Ligand binder design. Structure first.
Ligand SMILES: Nc1ncnc2c1ncn2[C@@H]1O[C@H](COP(=O)(O)OP(=O)(O)OP(=O)(O)O)[C@@H](O)[C@H]1O
Ligand SMILES: Nc1ncnc2c1ncn2[C@@H]1O[C@H](COP(=O)(O)OP(=O)(O)OP(=O)(O)O)[C@@H](O)[C@H]1O
Ligand SMILES: [Mg+2]
Ligand SMILES: [Mg+2]
Lengths: 517, 513, 308, 281
């Protein structure tokens, strides 16, 4: 009879062990991202749709999208009594930008003037601080960028521009084991054990000091760490979990039966693609452009997305996601993304008229991540439509699949995709198709595309930067640097105790206003 | 009404001729009945049918056994289970294979006495049962495993087990074949004291024809599964009528140096008490003799005297604690080293005590006998076949056996198979170990005639260990008496049988039926 | 024998050292490069990567990293686990649950296999023997994923007479259904070994003598036949004690157990060398110790088996 | 089993009229014919997938239905026989011979042979299989059936060695071993001729189970890309891929599993029929 204690007040959600300490500039995944986003609160906030609004800032003034004057609100504090000032933002951004600190989010500070001085190699250049940030009072500071950027104020909601308390730089390794934020939640007080049991769970309680845009309606959250999402589904059906946040692929056809009005769905800002390096044999030049154009006419995206994914993917209509502001599904020229076996074979024939096909076509992926089924389907459809032998290639380790892509040493096609960080289209295009971008894994060079994309950032308003982005996307329709496949759709299920579950612009539940009673 | 009745019993072994063909016998609840006969006649198969303990492929066909007035031939293994312990006791034939080798003899004796609780008094009733069976220090023997015992001590233990639940009848299958004459007299007069003041009955299967004469009250002669003769002891054992019984009673026993052993000693270290409290057992102690070539030396003594230990030390199969065995002057049997070994093993051959265990359950009789010939490369393929067939015929054994495995043989047929395997190579020295023991007088006569022929024509040398004193007076050239590991007396055959100069060897010489 | 045991425990040392060297070598030789996965599916700045490579000493020569690993296990200090934690804490969190579950599974499989095997070997060729053999082969053919999935479904979702998950609460009573599932692939082995031995030993000469004493069939069977037929199954059980730990990854995924197999799989897929090396070294230790214990058990089970 | 000379002609005759032997031999013959000549039983291509026929029910066109990709399941279960049977039988024979020889040598001599063999066994027994497969397959330019057999045998021989050593330990103190030494044999001839035939049952049992274990483990290897190229049909790969369609109520996992269970049953029956010819009754 002992034990059995139930949770009639805290909401039980699923999660995974954060693979890094809980520092804002040192997390880039989702498992740690969701906890960090509960814990802190930055200069701007997003709603469930992805609309930015001021949270800690009074004003963010600018007249040319190059110089910005930011004013902080009085009254905010961290959960130890210490106030939130301009120094809290400036010090944290300078900590994340410097190279000797070795932070995973260093690149997020690229647009600011002075970034190279601090992000080069240590010792070579002095100036441990970026010169673009300048404090004016304890409640005001200015920022200066390298080039006009209409997309800047929208980034200030990302979990990389969060503040930190000054009792955080004296010993950072300790802070990352027990953070102190200023957001809607705190780590559960503790006096039974630690609030964070590694590989087990994390408990959070509301924060009494928070008066912002994301006030909670719970009495606390508990992230229960699972492996094997089928087990989380079993616990949701048993009544031991409250929100599931993702349905396992084995239950995609039966959740409509089991949950039954306790499930909802909505589009997320994620996509997937198929990449072939422009240096492989037969895949370079115009003779390679025609082959990449023929590979996209040989894939049945509507059929795959409803036989393999059962409706949790949406066929691609451009090089971005469907959920983003400014998305146009009738762009002139996107009929290069339609299924057409005759067109595919015609393009293959006129590429062989330049140089005949010789060998194997392999698509590489990392094993134990759920890619076997759709990679099999894509390879099989290519093999049936053209005459060639296309195959799937699983790789043993994740490190080793990543090494071959980073070293520019892989010798086949590989699966790829993007995960947007903030609701902007340019964030799905600039880090991937510019000349020497870090995530430009296929080696695609086009100065005309670079210029057309830099001309959209320098637009006077966001309503006519979208037109310029959609015009820049025609160059991509013409060249086909990678083959886009589909966008994501997030399905979230819940129990009879919880009452207000909703999906957000990145496919996560809206944890703050889930009502349990 | 007799206590036990068997009328018309016939036993078959899995689609063969019946091993037992209509035997009849009765016992009358106060007496002794002896069962003598040839070697292979179905005497052990008759005792296993009465109790329901036949081997895997045997079963009764057309007979009945009625014990105490309650026909027990249809098993009904609760009727038989209420009988097997409390009303009928059993003593098996082979002393070595019939005890569980992992269960510490005292445990196995305490287990047998039942229908009682006794708490800790069972462990004191077991010691008394072992003392009555005739052991010389029971409290020690009860703390040993069967392999740390002598071959006669295991037999006395089997007797103590067979007398545990106070039976109304005892079926003993050659129960004294490893007890010399004095232990044998003790156990037999204990059994004779039991068959009075209680009424216990004995069914005694023996090959010793003298013993029966003075112990039994009725005699049954068996031959090829048929009861040839039956009646009073004397009027059969002294005035026979059937031709077979006549020949049997007649052909019964009546009444330069190759080896130089010097100061041999063997000492075992045993764990009496706590597994770290080690004791010492001096099996053999300072024995030394000399064997003239082309002669016979017998080794007699008490049970648990150190004769098989000495034999296996002479054969190079044990390692002495001290002393040496110099064979032929050249070979030092304690250290041959790689190349003297095969030439030594072609010339010296053993015959083990109970030869059933040394016969490789997976070999047939033919393969068992020819293995020596193919290890030493005598003939090609058919010379070996002819040799094996001639040996099998010389040891008085049917030719139908070639192809049978040792499990499905008689007790006196395994012994002859081992004797033939030993004689295969015609070795210069034959170390026998109580191997004429399971043979009746009329087969043992032929075996001894063959041995004498081989010694007369070739000049072989025999080291003969035995408990039968009528045979030793008939074949042996010298006698060596042992006791407690020490040599008591070593003299000629007559000067030990006529004018013995030791009180023990005199006592040993007047105990014989 | 005291001197035999002394020689064994003495030679356990250099083999342990050589095994540490060989295991470190084979884990070092994994094809990738750990830094390339320190940021997940996003690239690192070429200067941040240099900093991290120098911070984890991933640019030293081999045998320098090996000496650094080996000289530090004298203070505890097994490494630092790119997540930032010590490796001591990781192993101390992961091993107790695995040990408990492995003991439960061993006990279950021992009892069940020995019982069914002794009966099927006493009466072989019959309905019972046939059913036991087909059960073993059906267990072999069907993947352990399906078995765990269905057992959990039934006994935890429909008949709530078992926990669906044992995360954070691993009692000896909550770990009983996972133990039964884990000890199911080791069922055919135990059954067949016991069956072979019992069938061979059921017809010795001393079993007839024990029958003639008047003992019941249970006592005869158990004491004589069973006690004489225990060496190969004990060999297998001793060898499988070590495989129950480190190799229960599928069962620990169905029930949320958080054992050693998941830690090992994650460390291998991210190429975290100290974690893998420590786990595999502990496995080799367990095997050495259990094999020595099983040899002494041989000596205890048969008094004629003595070492020298 | 080394030297059962004497009468193989009597054993073979005693083994002929044994219904278990006859049935097991007929089943084995059928399995071998299916694994040798697949084109007698089906005309379809096992590696052709029409995706507009994703998951159909068994009919006159497809006797077992289709699977998520659109392959014919009957063709795939007929053509997986070659790979699955080859891997299982090869690895079983390899571990039997090697581990049996090593363990029987260790258990019989016992001085330093035992030391080295048992320490190597303790090391090989505690080292995982996937780690070593990943490390070793980085040099093999081509995956094949023989590389998979090599990996599986090289990491599966120790548990057979342990059982063989334990089995020979009991026998090497018997009396027929002393009788063989007193006849003049050396330790190796004694080992073979007397101690192998008398201590060979347990090894047969563990081998007959290891067969199916190997057929299942090859799929674990193939799934990660370190064995048996993806253009090869196999039982076990099909089970692994089809186990996920089971929540939806589709029983397509049991078609290759049935064939696997039948092969394991046939070889178990054969092994017991062969083992009952060394102690007949
Ligand atoms: N298990 C068996 N299978 C087949 N035949 C057997 C079996 N046991 C005994 N026999 C046959 O039964 C016959 C008689 O056997 P039994 O052991 O009863 O003789 P015996 O009188 O005990 O001989 P002795 O005691 O003198 O050796 C033998 O000829 C033997 O061939
Ligand atoms: N393995 C052993 N360990 C300890 N003591 C033993 C062992 N084998 C024999 N003994 C002891 O050595 C002594 C000599 O026994 P041995 O077998 O030589 O007697 P034996 O003369 O052959 O007796 P029998 O004529 O009754 O067979 C016995 O007292 C026995 O208890
Ligand atoms: Mg007899
Ligand atoms: Mg003796």
């Amino acid at each position: 009879c002992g034990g059995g204690v139930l949770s009639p007040d805290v909401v039980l959600v699923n999660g995974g062990e954060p693979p890094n300490p809980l520092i804002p500039t040192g997390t880039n995944d989702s498992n740690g991202g969701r906890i960090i986003d509960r814990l802190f609160a930055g200069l701007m906030s997003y709603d469930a749709v992805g609309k930015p609004s001021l949270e800690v800032a009074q004003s963010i003034e600018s007249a040319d999208n190059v110089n910005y004057r930011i004013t902080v609100k009085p009254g905010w504090k961290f959960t130890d009594g210490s106030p939130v000032t301009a120094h809290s933002f400036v010090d944290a951004w300078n900590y994340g930008a410097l190279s000797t600190n070795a932070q995973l989010q260093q690149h997020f500070f690229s647009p600011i003037e002075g970034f190279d001085d601090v992000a080069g190699a240590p010792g070579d250049k002095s100036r441990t601080t970026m010169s673009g940030l300048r404090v004016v009072n304890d409640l005001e500071f200015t920022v200066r960028l390298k080039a006009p950027t209409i997309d800047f104020t929208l980034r200030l909601g990302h979990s990389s521009f969060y503040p930190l308390p000054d009792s955080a730089f004296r010993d950072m390794a300790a802070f990352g084991r027990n953070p102190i934020g200023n957001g809607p939640y705190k780590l559960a007080d503790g006096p039974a054990g630690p609030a964070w049991e590694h590989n087990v769970r994390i408990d959070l309680v509301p924060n009494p000091d928070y008066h912002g845009n994301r006030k909670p309606r719970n009495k606390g959250l508990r992230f229960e760490f699972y492996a094997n999402l089928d087990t989380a589904y079993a616990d949701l059906l048993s009544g031991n979990l409250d929100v599931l946040d993702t349905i396992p692929p084995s239950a995609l056809t039966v959740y409509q039966r089991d949950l039954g009005d306790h499930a909802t769905s909505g589009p997320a800002a994620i996509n997937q693609t198929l990449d072939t390096p422009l240096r492989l044999p037969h895949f370079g030049g115009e003779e390679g452009r025609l082959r990449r154009l023929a590979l996209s006419a040989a894939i049945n995206r509507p059929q795959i997305c409803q036989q393999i994914f059962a409706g949790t993917r949406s066929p691609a209509r451009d090089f971005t996601a469907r959920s983003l502001p400014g998305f146009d599904p009738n762009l002139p020229g996107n009929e290069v993304l339609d299924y057409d076996p005759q067109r595919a074979r015609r393009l293959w024939a006129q590429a062989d008229a330049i140089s005949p096909w010789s060998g194997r076509y392999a698509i590489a992926y990392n094993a134990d991540a759920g890619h076997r089924d759709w990679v099999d389907a894509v390879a099989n459809s290519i093999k049936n439509v053209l005459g060639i032998d296309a195959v799937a290639a699983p790789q043993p380790t994740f490190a080793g699949f990543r090494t071959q892509i980073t070293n520019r040493a892989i010798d086949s096609a590989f699966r790829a995709g993007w995960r947007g960080d903030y609701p902007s289209m340019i964030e799905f295009l600039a880090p991937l198709f510019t000349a020497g971008a870090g995530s430009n894994d296929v080696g695609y060079i086009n100065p005309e595309f670079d210029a057309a994309l830099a001309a959209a950032e320098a637009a006077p308003t966001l309503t006519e930067s979208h037109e310029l982005v959609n015009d820049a996307q025609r160059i991509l329709f013409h060249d086909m640097p990678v083959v886009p496949l589909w966008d994501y759709i997030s399905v979230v299920g819940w129990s009879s105790q919880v009452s207000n579950v909703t999906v957000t612009w990145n496919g996560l539940p809206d944890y703050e206003n889930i009502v349990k009673a | 009404a007799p206590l036990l009745s068997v009328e018309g019993l016939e036993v078959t072994f899995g689609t063969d001729a019946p091993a037992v063909c209509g035997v009849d016998l009765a016992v009358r609840s106060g007496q002794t009945v002896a069962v003598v006969g040839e070697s292979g006649s179905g005497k052990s198969t008759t005792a296993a049918a009465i109790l329901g303990l036949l081997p895997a492929g045997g079963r009764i066909t057309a007979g009945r056994v009625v014990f105490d007035g309650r026909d027990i031939t249809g098993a009904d293994a609760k009727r038989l289970r209420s009988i097997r312990g409390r009303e009928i006791g059993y003593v098996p034939q082979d002393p070595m294979t019939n005890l569980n080798p992992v269960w510490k003899v005292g445990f196995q004796v305490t287990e047998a006495l039942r229908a009682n609780t006794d708490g800790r008094a069972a462990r004191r009733r077991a010691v008394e049962l072992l003392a009555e069976a005739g052991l010389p220090d029971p409290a020690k023997q009860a703390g040993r495993y069967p392999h740390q015992l002598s071959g006669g001590m295991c037999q006395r233990a089997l007797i103590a087990i067979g007398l545990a639940g106070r039976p109304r009848l005892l079926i003993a299958d050659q129960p004294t074949s490893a007890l010399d004459v004095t232990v044998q007299r003790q156990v037999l007069d204990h059994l004779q004291g039991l068959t009075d003041e209680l009424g216990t009955a004995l069914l005694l299967i023996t090959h010793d024809l003298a013993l029966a004469a003075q112990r039994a009250e009725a005699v049954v002669v068996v031959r090829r599964g048929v009861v040839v003769e039956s009646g009073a002891a004397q009027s059969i054992l002294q005035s026979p009528q059937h031709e077979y019984t006549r020949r049997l009673v007649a052909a019964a026993p009546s009444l330069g140096d190759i080896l130089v052993v010097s100061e041999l000693t063997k000492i075992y270290r045993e764990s009496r008490g706590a597994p770290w409290r080690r004791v010492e057992s001096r099996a053999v102690d300072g024995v030394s003799f000399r064997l003239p070539r082309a002669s016979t030396l017998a080794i007699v003594g008490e049970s648990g005297s150190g004769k098989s230990t000495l034999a296996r030390m002479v054969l190079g199969l044990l390692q002495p604690t001290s002393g040496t065995v110099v064979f032929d002057g050249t070979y030092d049997v304690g250290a041959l080293a790689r190349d003297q070994v095969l030439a030594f093993r072609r010339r010296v051959q053993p015959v083990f005590q109970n030869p059933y265990s040394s016969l490789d359950p997976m070999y047939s009789v033919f393969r068992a006998i020819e293995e020596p010939l193919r290890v030493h490369h005598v003939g090609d393929r058919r010379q070996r076949q002819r040799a094996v067939r001639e040996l099998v015929d010389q040891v008085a054994l049917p030719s139908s056996i070639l192809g049978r495995r040792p499990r499905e043989l008689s007790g006196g047929q395994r012994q002859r198979v081992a004797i033939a395997r030993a004689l295969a190579l015609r070795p210069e020295v034959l170390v026998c170990d109580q191997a004429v023991s399971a043979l009746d007088v009329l087969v043992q006569a032929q075996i001894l005639d063959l041995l004498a022929d081989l010694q007369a024509d070739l000049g072989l040398t025999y080291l003969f260990i035995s408990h039968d004193l009528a045979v030793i007076r008939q074949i042996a050239d010298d006698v060596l008496v042992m006791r407690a590991g020490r040599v008591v007396e070593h003299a000629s055959t007559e000067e030990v049988f006529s004018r013995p100069r030791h009180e023990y060897t005199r006592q040993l010489l007047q105990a014989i039926p | 024998m005291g001197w035999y045991v002394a020689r064994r425990v003495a030679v356990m040392v250099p083999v342990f050292l050589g095994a540490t060297l060989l295991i470190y070598g084979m884990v070092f030789l994994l094809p990738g490069d750990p830094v390339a996965a320190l940021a997940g599916d996003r690239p690192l700045t070429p200067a941040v990567a240099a900093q991290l490579r120098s911070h984890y000493h991933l640019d030293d020569p081999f045998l320098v990293q090996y000496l650094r690993y080996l000289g530090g296990i004298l203070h505890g200090d097994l490494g630092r686990a790119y997540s930032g934690l010590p490796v001591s804490a990781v192993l101390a969190h992961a091993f107790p649950v695995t040990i408990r579950l492995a003991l439960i599974a061993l006990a279950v499989e021992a009892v069940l296999g020995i019982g069914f095997g002794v009966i099927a070997g006493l009466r072989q060729g019959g309905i019972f023997d046939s059913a036991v053999l087909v059960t073993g082969l059906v267990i072999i053919a069907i993947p352990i994923f399906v078995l765990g999935f269905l057992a959990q479904f039934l006994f935890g979702v429909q008949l709530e007479i078992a926990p669906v998950t044992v995360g954070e609460r691993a009692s000896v009573g909550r770990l009983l259904l996972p133990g039964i599932v884990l000890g199911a692939m080791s069922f055919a082995y135990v059954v067949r070994l016991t069956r072979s031995a019992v069938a061979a030993n059921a017809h010795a000469d001393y079993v007839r003598t024990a029958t003639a004493k008047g003992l019941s069939r249970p006592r005869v069977v158990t004491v004589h036949i069973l006690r004489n037929s225990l060496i190969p199954v004990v060999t297998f059980l001793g060898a499988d004690l070590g495989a129950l730990m480190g190799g229960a990854i599928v069962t620990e995924g169905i029930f949320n157990i958080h054992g050693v197999g998941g830690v090992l799989y994650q460390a291998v897929t991210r190429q975290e060398t100290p974690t893998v090396v420590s786990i595999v070294t502990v496995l080799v230790l367990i095997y050495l110790i259990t094999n020595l214990l099983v040899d002494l058990l041989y000596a205890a089970l048969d008094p004629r088996i003595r070492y020298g | 089993m080394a030297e059962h000379t004497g009468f193989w002609l009597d054993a073979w005759r005693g083994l002929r009229r044994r219904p278990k032997f006859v049935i097991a031999a007929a089943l084995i013959l059928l399995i071998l014919v299916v694994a040798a000549f697949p084109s007698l039983f089906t005309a379809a291509d096992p590696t052709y997938a029409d995706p507009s026929q994703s998951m159909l029910a068994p009919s006159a066109a497809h006797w077992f239905g289709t699977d998520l990709q659109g392959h014919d399941i009957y063709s795939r279960t007929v053509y997986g026989a070659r790979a699955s049977v080859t891997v299982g039988l090869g690895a079983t024979l390899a571990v039997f011979v090697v581990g049996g020889a090593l363990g029987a040598l260790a258990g019989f001599y016992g001085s330093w042979i035992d030391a080295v063999v048992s320490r190597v066994t303790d090391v090989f027994l505690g080292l995982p299989l996937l780690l070593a497969a990943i490390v070793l397959m980085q040099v093999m330019h081509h995956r094949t059936v023989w590389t998979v057999i090599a990996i599986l045998a090289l990491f599966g021989w120790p548990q057979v060695a342990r059982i063989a050593r334990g089995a020979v330990l009991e026998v090497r103190a018997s009396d027929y071993v002393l009788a063989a030494k007193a006849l003049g044999l050396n330790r190796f001839q004694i080992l073979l001729r007397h101690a192998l035939p008398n201590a060979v049952g347990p090894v047969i049992a563990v081998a007959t189970v290891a067969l199916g274990i190997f057929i299942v483990t090859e799929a674990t290897l193939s799934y990660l890309g370190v064995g048996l190229p993806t253009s090869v049909v196999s039982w076990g790969g099909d089970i692994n891929v089809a186990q996920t369609r089971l929540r939806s109520g589709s029983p397509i996992l049991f078609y290759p599993a049935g064939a696997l269970a039948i092969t394991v049953l046939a070889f178990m029956m054969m092994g017991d029929a062969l083992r009952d010819a060394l102690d007949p009754a």
